Amino acid sequence: RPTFYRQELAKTIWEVPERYQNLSPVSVCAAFDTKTGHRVAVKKLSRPFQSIIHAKRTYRELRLLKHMKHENVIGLLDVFTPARSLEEFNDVYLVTHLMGADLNNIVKCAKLTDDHVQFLIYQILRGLKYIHSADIIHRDLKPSNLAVNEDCELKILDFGVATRWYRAPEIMLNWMHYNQTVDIWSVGCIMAELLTGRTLFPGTDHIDQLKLILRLVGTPGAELLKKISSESARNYIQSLAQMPKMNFANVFIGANPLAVDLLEKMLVLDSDKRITAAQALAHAYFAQYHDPDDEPVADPYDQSFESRDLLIDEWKSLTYDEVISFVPPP
Numbered sequence: 001r002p003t004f005y006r007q008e009l010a011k012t013i014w015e016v017p018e019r020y021q022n023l024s025p026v027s028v029c030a031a032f033d034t035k036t037g038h039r040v041a042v043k044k045l046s047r048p049f050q051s052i053i054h055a056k057r058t059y060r061e062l063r064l065l066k067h068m069k070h071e072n073v074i075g076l077l078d079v080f081t082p083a084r085s086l087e088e089f090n091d092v093y094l095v096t097h098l099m100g101a102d103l104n105n106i107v108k109c110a111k112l113t114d115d116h117v118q119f120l121i122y123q124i125l126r127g128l129k130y131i132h133s134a135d136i137i138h139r140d141l142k143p144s145n146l147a148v149n150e151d152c153e154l155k156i157l158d159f160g161v162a163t164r165w166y167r168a169p170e171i172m173l174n175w176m177h178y179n180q181t182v183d184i185w186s187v188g189c190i191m192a193e194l195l196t197g198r199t200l201f202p203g204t205d206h207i208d209q210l211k212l213i214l215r216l217v218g219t220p221g222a223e224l225l226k227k228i229s230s231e232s233a234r235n236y237i238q239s240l241a242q243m244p245k246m247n248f249a250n251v252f253i254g255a256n257p258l259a260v261d262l263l264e265k266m267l268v269l270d271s272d273k274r275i276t277a278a279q280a281l282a283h284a285y286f287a288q289y290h291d292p293d294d295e296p297v298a299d300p301y302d303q304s305f306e307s308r309d310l311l312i313d314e315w316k317s318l319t320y321d322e323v324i325s326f327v328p329p330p
């Protein structure tokens with residue numbers, strides 16, 4: 001066992017090992033990792049075991065981060081607790097490499113060059129292909145969930161910019177039976193945004209959002225229309241069939257034609273027809289970076305627990321289990 005030291009940052013108390021120095025708020029804190037001489041990010045889980053929800057939510061995030069090992073996905077450097085036993089196990093801290101900024105700020109500086117868009121979207125798809133391997137769906141892919149530093153290297157993550165604007169329609173209206181291409185749809189909204197600099201579908205609510213989406217992609221067709229279970233949506237769609245649609249080559253005038261093609265294949269209402277992460281990686285638009293041998297999938301991930309209903313102390317224990325069994329990366 002290490003040796004921690006107390007400290008209070010903006011009301012929050014912090015008990016981390018001497019190994020980490022210069023804690024500076026950013027709730028997460030920026031710190032210096034004395035063991036590697038690298039700057040890190042330290043997130044103290046708020047009230048991890050306050051309710052069964054937080055306990056499961058706390059356990060879920062720990063299991064995930066411990067499983068993610070890809071250059072384009074946030075990875076767990078360290079997970080510690082000032083607790084010396086399970087009984088006194090009330091605090092959880094997670095550690096990762098510090099980073100530059102959201103794809104927000106890193107875009108506020110410009111509109112991004114076509115090569116920058118290729119490289120950025122290319123790393124999102126590479127990280128996406130990986131996590132999709134473990135049958136994991138992000139469900140909240142958006143500018144603020146992407147970390148990019150100076151080198152222009154990207155990494156996906158989830159902080160827990162309306163997520164709305166990027167949400168796929170199957171998921172926004174809910175039919176309970178989606179797929180991983182919910183994420184690809186979001187990628188299309190971000191990609192489009194980098195190329196144009198402006199938000200593709202800046203709706204005000206779920207009703208506004210849909211109007212925006214349809215005015216571009218058009219109203220559902222027979223094939224897509226006979227796949228909608230809920231009559232409620234079925235009726236709405238077949239009613240508001242009035243929205244002057246568009247033709248991508250126009251909506252994105254002057255963009256790499258390879259780029260507008262990709263979008264066409266990402267921004268489809270039919271999740272059954274939407275391109276996948278692995279398929280987009282092979283799109284000619286990324287021909288400059290694509291390498292089928294450096295685009296790894298993930299080991300299978302056990303999501304059994306998602307369906308279990310346990311006490312707070314049980315989720316707490318499994319969480320403690322995960323904390324002790326942590327094997328730091330090389």
Ligand SMILES: Cc1ccc(-[n+]2[nH]c(C(C)(C)C)cc2NC(=O)Nc2ccc(-c3ccc(CN4CCOCC4)nc3)c3ccccc23)cc1
Nearest residue numbers: 028041043057061074094096099100101102156157158159
């Ligand atoms: C209930 C549940 C379940 C899962 C869940 N997921 N899922 C994922 C996927 C694998 C799907 C992408 C990731 C993820 N959670 C995640 O990545 N958590 C974190 C987010 C964010 C930070 C974090 C904050 C500020 C900063 C500092 N600023 C400087 C400027 O640039 C932006 C970043 N850095 C990092 C962080 C830090 C340490 C440790 C963890 C962290 C989140 C909640």
